[PDB]
Amino acid sequence: SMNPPPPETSNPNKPKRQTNQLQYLLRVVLKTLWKHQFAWPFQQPVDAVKLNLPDYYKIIKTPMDMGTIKKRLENNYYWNAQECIQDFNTMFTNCYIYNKPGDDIVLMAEALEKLFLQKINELPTEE
C-alpha cells in the first residue's frame, strides 16, 4: 500500500549520449504527449496512497511515467532511443495490466499511445 522509491533519473556512472533520435524523443514525442488533455495522470509516478490503489505496486513492478521520462531526457540519462521508447511502452503496458478495458484511464493511455505510435513512425534516421 505504500509508495516505492521512484525510478532512477540520475546515474553518473551510466554512460550517456545526446543523439538526434533522443532529441526528437524530447522535442517531438514527449512534448506532444505532455501537452495532451489526457497527459495529467501520467505526468508523475503513481501515488498509490493518495489514489487509494494499495495493490498498484504489488502488480506493477516496472513503474514508469512521463515525469520520469521527461527528467531522463532533460538530464541525458539514456544511451539510445530504444531505452526511451521502452520507457513509454512500459508506461502504457502498466496501465493496461493494472486496469480493465474501457476504464477512463485506459482510454487516456490509448489516446496517448496512438500519438506516440504516429511520432515513432516518423523517428529520424540516426545522424
Ligand SMILES: Cc1nnc2scc(-c3ccccc3)n12
Ligand atoms: C495512471 C494510472 N494508472 N492506473 C491507474 S488507476 C488511476 C490512475 C490515475 C488516475 C488519475 C491520476 C493519477 C493516476 N492510474
Ligand SMILES: [K+]
Ligand atoms: K488488465
